Amino acid sequence: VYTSEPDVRVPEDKPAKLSCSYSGFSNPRVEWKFAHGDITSLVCYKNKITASYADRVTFSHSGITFHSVTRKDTGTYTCMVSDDGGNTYGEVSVQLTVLVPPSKPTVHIPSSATIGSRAVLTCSEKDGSPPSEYYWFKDGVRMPLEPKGNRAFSNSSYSLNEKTGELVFDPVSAWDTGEYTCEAQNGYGMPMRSEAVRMEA
Partner 1 sequence: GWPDTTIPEKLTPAGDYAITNKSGNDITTAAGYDGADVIVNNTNFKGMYICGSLQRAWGDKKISNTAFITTATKVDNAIEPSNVIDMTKIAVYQDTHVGKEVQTSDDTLSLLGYTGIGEQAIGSDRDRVVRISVLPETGARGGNHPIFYKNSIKLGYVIRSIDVFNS
Q: Judged by CB, which is closer to a copy of itself: 69, or 78?
A: 78
Minimum distance from residue 70 beta carbon to partner 1 (Å): 13
Task: End-to-end CA distance of the chain: give it in Å, rounded.
Answer: 62
Out of 40, 41, 52, 60, the only residue in the binding site for partner 1 (CB under 8 A) is: 60
Q: Alpha-carbon Rg of the chain, whole angstroms? A: 24
Sign of CA dihedral 51, 52, 56, 62: negative
Instruction: Looking at residues 1 to 20 of the shown chain, list those that interact with a copy of itself (rule: CB under 8 A).
Output: 1
Q: Which residues contact 97 (CB under 8 A, 6 or more apart)?
A: 8, 9, 10, 74, 129, 130
Q: Binding of a copy of itself at residue 71 (CB under 8 A)?
A: no
Minimum distance from residue 60 beta carbon to partner 1 (Å): 4
Out of 25, 97, 122, 137, the only residue in the binding site for partner 1 (CB under 8 A) is: 25
The CA distance from 12 to 153, in Å, is 41
Site map 127..146 versus a copy of itself, x via CB under 8 A = --------------xx-xx-
Angle at Cα 178 formed by Cα 176 and Cα 184, nearest 5°? 105
Number of residues that bind partner 1 (CB under 8 A): 31
Out of 6, 12, 21, 50, the only residue in the binding site for partner 1 (CB under 8 A) is: 21
At 79, which amino acid appears? C
List of residues contacting partner 1 (CB under 8 A): 2, 4-5, 13-19, 21-28, 58, 60-63, 65-68, 101, 188-190
